[PDB]
Each structure stands twice: as C-alpha cells, then as structure tokens.
C-alpha cells in the first residue's frame, strides 16, 4: 500500500485543519493524504502495525511513543540540523529513544498557575507567600488556592522544585536504578503541601471537579491546571489570567511536559513522503496555522510560529512553565511510578503516613505497583 499517506490523529485535535494541509500536499505532489480520527487510536496502533498494517503517520503524546519504539513499531526519523534548528531543543529530547529520534515534536503542554484577576490582580511569585494570602482572602469569604490533590501530576511541580525527580536523566537516558522521589528536595516540597492542608489553606479531599467548580464560580483566587481547562473558564466568564507557577525555596516549580508528536510507522513503504509532508508542509507557519485555525494547538515546538502565538500571554506562560519543567519520561516504568507516588501523596496528606515514610515507599515500591 505504497504511494499515499494515511494519518491518525486524536479527535480532540484539528483534524479538519490537518486535512487542508493534506489537500495542499496533494495539489503539489499528486499524493493522496487521508486523515482519520479513530476512537482508541493509541491502543489500536500496536494491534494493527505489529502485523505491518496501520497508518503511515500517527499523532499522539510523546510518552506513549517509547512503548512503540521498544516494540520496533516506529521508524528513525532523519531531519537534518537545519530542520532541527527550527524547533526548540528541549522538544527533541522528548522524542528520543535509545539515542535515536523517533517522532517530530508538534505541540507542548504543561501546567500553569491560573488566577482570578478581579480577586487577585497581582498573583504570588512564591509558594511561601500563599498562606498569608489565604488569610487575607478568608477575611473576604474566599480562599487563595484550590487544585486537584488526588492526582500526583498536579502536585509534582512543587515536589520537584527543590530537587525531587522521578528517574535520573543523563546523556539522553533514564537511569531506572536512580530514583529521586524520596530525596531531600522531594520531601521538602511534599512537606510544604502537607502543611498547607494541616493549616487549612487546602483540603486533602479536593479533586479535579471540586477545584474546577470553585475556580469557575469565583470562590478561590487561583488554581493549577492546563490549557485543556481554559475553554470551561471562558464559558464561566471569570476574568482570569495564566502565569508562571510560584517558586519554592527560590527555585522554579517543574511541571512534567507532554509533547504532541508525529511518528512514522516502521512498516510504512511511504517513509520518504512522510518526511517531506511533515517537514515541508505541516511543520511550517502555514501548516501549523491551518491546524490551529480549526482547534488551537496551544504552545508549539516550531519557534517561528510559537513566537507568533505567544502574543497570547496564556500560551507564553504554558511555554514558560514547560521550559522550567521536565519532559514526561517515555519509559514503560512511569505507570508503576505514578501509581506509587499517587498513594504516597494521598497517605501523606491524610496523616496515614508521614512524608518520609510515604516517599520512601514510592522510591522503593517492591510489589506494590503490581495490581490487583
């Protein structure tokens, strides 16, 4: 099935805009490009490719692609130095597996601090400031901060700020023997979170929908969330802004970064066409804008178009928190790690475990991450 391009992308992306780029590529080359948005595409792709079928190009979060590459399902991509120079260097980091590039970065996503400009026109630059801020707001019938404490993705930026990390990352490789989740930095960040809860500035039970409800009805001055939340805040009419996360111990909060990426199916007989399409049609200002026009990509990896889009301070902030954070590791071990950390944060925040006990357990999981 040579001579064409079949592309899979998720249904919450601008697939109709990507279809217009496919139509331009066909006008110029005569090669037909078909864009599909299957349900469950990231589960379906290894099922169909592993028997040398599937699309020629697949778009998904970079972290799943480690999995695919481990199974030999993705081609090494081959952009020259001049092409790689057009994207932010930290993005190339996300699409490396065994020192080889395995996908093109497209867009970048990370948490930011979202604030209610009517309640809080000058938001805090530091975590250490938030308790006093909370006191002032509580006197007005409001609170300083609510965010999801049930999922450790949302709490991680504070945990990593003073030096906590998941898996040491050096020379383009994760050392899974070297876990940083119980080091002195991680303990200090988590102890700060636990103290906030002990001191009634936050509630251990708060989850994604409680925090979103409070922010969007103007009951709390701040929340921590990502660009997937903006359109709900737009519906609410809150006058919000989006900014840099606070520092802790004078160091930046470090959210994990998700890189929407495009990989080439190892079994495609159309690898050269895929490279030309991605490098010369999609990853240019005109190509990304065709997609963005349809549904906003957020912050993008291509520097020239990101600079254009970053006139929107919300998008500038996303990129700013992303460059201060770290790439989500693309290794299969992350899912056991996230399960152990999630228990750790819940147990420390409830009083069930101390911070030191909780985190030692996350670093040294034993059999704890084999469910059920």
Q: Which residues bind a copy of itself (CB under 8 A)?
A: 67, 70, 167, 176-177, 179, 332-333, 336-337, 363-372
Residues 6+ apart with CB under 8 A from 241: 114, 115, 117, 123, 313, 314
What span, in angstroms and rounded, lies between the C-alpha atoms of 87 and 315?
Answer: 16
Minimum CB separation from a copy of itself for residue 368, in Å?
5
139 binds, among Mg ion, a copy of itself, none (CB under 5 to 8 A by kind): none
Minimum CB separation from a copy of itself for residue 177, in Å?
5
Question: Tokens standing for 173?
Answer: 């490789």
Minimum CB separation from a copy of itself for residue 71, in Å?
8
Q: Which is nearer to a copy of itself, 123 or 180 (CB)?
A: 180
Q: Which is nearer to Mg ion, 81 or 177 (CB)?
A: 81
179 binds, among a copy of itself, Mg ion, none (CB under 5 to 8 A by kind): a copy of itself
What span, in angstroms and rounded, lies between the C-alpha atoms of 212 and 201?
Answer: 17
Buried b or exposed e, range 178-191, using 16+ CB within 10 angstroms:
ebbbbeebbbbbbb
Minimum CB separation from a copy of itself for residue 70, in Å?
6
What span, in angstroms and rounded, lies between the C-alpha atoms of 127 and 130?
Answer: 5
372 binds, among Mg ion, a copy of itself, none (CB under 5 to 8 A by kind): a copy of itself
Question: Tokens standing for 356?
Answer: 């030191």
80 makes contact with Mg ion (CB under 5 A): yes
28 binds, among Mg ion, a copy of itself, none (CB under 5 to 8 A by kind): none
Minimum CB separation from Mg ion for residue 76, in Å?
17
Question: Tokens standing for 13?
Answer: 């992306």
Distances (CA, A) of 129 to 29, 156, 214, 246, 249: 58, 19, 21, 9, 11
369 binds, among a copy of itself, Mg ion, none (CB under 5 to 8 A by kind): a copy of itself
Q: Which is nearer to a copy of itself, 82 or 371 (CB)?
A: 371
Query: How many residues make contact with Mg ion (CB under 5 A)?
Result: 1
DSSP per-residue string spanning 209-269: HHHHHHHHTTSBSEEEE-GGGHHHHHHHT--EEEEPPPEETTEE---EEEEEEEEEBTT-S
**Cβ-closest residue to Mg ion?**
80
What span, in angstroms and rounded, lies between the C-alpha atoms of 150 and 248?
Answer: 21
Minimum CB separation from a copy of itself for residue 364, in Å?
5
Minimum CB separation from Mg ion for residue 205, in Å?
52
Q: Which is nearer to Mg ion, 12 or 80 (CB)?
A: 80
80 binds, among Mg ion, a copy of itself, none (CB under 5 to 8 A by kind): Mg ion
Residues that bind Mg ion (CB under 5 A): 80
């Amino acid at each position: 099935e040579e001579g064409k391009l079949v592309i899979w992308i998720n249904g919450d992306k601008g697939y109709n805009g990507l279809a217009e780029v496919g139509k331009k590529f066909e006008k110029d080359t005569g090669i037909k490009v078909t864009v599909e948005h299957p349900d469950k595409l990231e589960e379906k792709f290894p099922q169909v490719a592993a028997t040398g079928d599937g699309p020629d190009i697949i778009f998904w979060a970079h972290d799943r692609f480690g999995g695919y590459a481990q199974s030999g399902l993705l081609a090494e991509i081959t952009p020259d130095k001049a092409f790689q120079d057009k994207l932010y260097p930290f993005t190339w980091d996300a699409v490396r597996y065994n020192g080889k590039l395995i996908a093109y970065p497209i867009a970048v996503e990370a948490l930011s601090l979202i604030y209610n400009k009517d309640l809080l026109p000058n938001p805090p630059k530091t975590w250490e400031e938030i308790p006093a801020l909370d006191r002032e707001l509580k006197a007005k019938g409001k609170s300083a901060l609510m965010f999801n404490l049930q999922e450790p993705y949302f709490t991680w930026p504070l945990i990593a700020a003073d030096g906590g990390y998941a898996f040491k990352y050096e020379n383009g490789k994760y050392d899974i023997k070297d876990v940083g989740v119980d080091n002195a930095g991680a303990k200090a960040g988590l102890t700060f979170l636990v103290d906030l809860i002990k001191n009634k500035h936050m509630n251990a039970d708060t989850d994604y929908s409680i925090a979103e409800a409070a922010f969007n009805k103007g009951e709390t001055a701040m929340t921590i969330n990502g660009p997937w939340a903006w359109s709900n805040i737009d519906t609410s009419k809150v006058n919000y802004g989006v900014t840099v996360l606070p520092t802790f111990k004078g160091q930046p909060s470090k959210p994990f970064v998700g890189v929407l990426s495009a990989g080439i199916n190892a079994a495609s007989p159309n690898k050269e066409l895929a490279k030309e399409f991605l490098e010369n049609y999609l990853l240019t200002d005109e190509g990304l804008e065709a997609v963005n026009k349809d549904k906003p990509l957020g912050a993008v990896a291509l520097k020239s178009y990101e600079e254009e889009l970053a006139k929107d301070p919300r998008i500038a902030a996303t990129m700013e928190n992303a460059q201060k954070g770290e790439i989500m590791p693309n290794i299969p071990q992350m899912s056991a790690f996230w399960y152990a950390v999630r228990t750790a944060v819940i147990n420390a925040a409830s009083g069930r475990q101390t911070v030191d006990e909780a985190l030692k357990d996350a670093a040294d999981p034993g059999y704890d991450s084999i469910i059920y």
